[PDB]
């Protein structure tokens, strides 16, 4: 099939062959195949699913990133990635208080635009922690 | 001057010693330590350099 | 009087060798200290290994301090102690417990103590 390699600044969050990714894009979810679409894009506050050989998934948050998937060997980089069990359900319901908090907390545009990504941060953890659970 | 002076220098010296010796073990915590934070900062560059290999093509 | 012409080449070149190991490993040990036992390569980690199984068969219980050891004195004859560091630095006897040549007296002993350490 074909190798992915994932990296941000801190840690190298996956590297092998892998047989198909489901992975956050810049208008949408997007969906790679061996041999697909030869695309670089940013990505959206979200999560990549791993399915491997013999069918094994696993769960990468992407709070932020842009990748390439032209090359047999692709590439996400990762402003910030967290693994699918150092992050918890439990920690992303707290996510889920603090962008509610901060919602009733901003009151003009500027600090709105901060709060809109504390609830995107949030949002996006709340959604890994339950494809976790497959 | 005389022996009086000369044992003073000695003990200068072996003083030096020491801490010219402290400051050896201290660097090579450092150096592992900082060893860390170069492996780990290499995958994220090995990335990079790959990327741009992609954009001269 | 450690000349090969008047003990002979057996016991010399067993003296030079425990003299050669302990050397080494008391070089070893500023590497184990300012670096750790993570750089020290497999071979390296072997004289250690054996180093520490020379210093401690360099032990003995004298039959004068049976009052503080608790334990019955040891005479060893030249040949046997020559034959037992011959061994250890030949790499027979590699296999045995550290603590198992503590005290014990001749190499024919820490095989003895060995197994039921």
């Known amino acids: 099939t074909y190798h992915l390699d994932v990296v941000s600044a801190e840690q190298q969050m996956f590297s092998g062959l892998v047989e198909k990714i489901q992975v956050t894009g810049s208008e949408g979810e997007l969906g790679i195949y061996p041999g697909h679409a030869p695309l670089l894009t940013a990505i959206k506050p979200g999560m990549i699913r791993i399915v491997k050989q013999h069918g094994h998934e696993e769960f990468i948050y992407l709070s932020g990133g842009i990748l390439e998937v032209q090359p047999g060997n692709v590439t996400v980089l990762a402003d910030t990635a967290i693994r699918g069990q150092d992050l918890d359900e439990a920690r992303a319901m707290e996510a889920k208080r603090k962008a509610e908090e901060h919602i009733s907390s901003s009151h003009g545009d500027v600090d709105y635009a901060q709060a809109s990504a504390e609830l995107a941060k949030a949002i996006a953890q709340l959604r890994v922690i339950e494809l976790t659970k497959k | ?57 | 009087q450690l000349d090969p012409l008047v003990v002979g080449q057996e016991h010399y070149d067993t003296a030079r060798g425990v003299q050669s190991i302990l050397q080494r490993y008391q070089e070893l040990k500023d590497i184990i200290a300012i670096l750790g036992m993570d750089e020290l390569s497999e071979e390296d980690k072997l004289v250690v290994a054996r180093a520490r199984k020379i210093q401690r068969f360099l032990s003995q219980p004298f039959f004068v301090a049976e009052v503080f050891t608790g334990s019955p004195g040891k005479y060893v004859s030249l040949k046997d102690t020559i034959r037992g560091f011959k061994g250890i630095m030949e790499g027979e006897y590699d296999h045995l417990p550290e603590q198992a040549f503590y005290m014990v007296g001749s190499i024919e002993e820490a095989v003895e103590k060995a197994k039921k350490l």
Not at chain 2, 20 to 42: H, L
């Open chain 2, 1 to 57: 001057a005389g022996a009086k002076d000369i044992r003073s220098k000695i003990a200068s010296v072996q003083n030096t010693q020491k801490i010219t010796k402290a400051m050896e073990m201290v660097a090579a915590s450092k150096m592992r330590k900082s060893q860390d934070r170069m492996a780990a900062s290499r995958p994220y560059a090995e990335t990079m350099r790959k990327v741009i290999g992609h954009l001269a093509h």
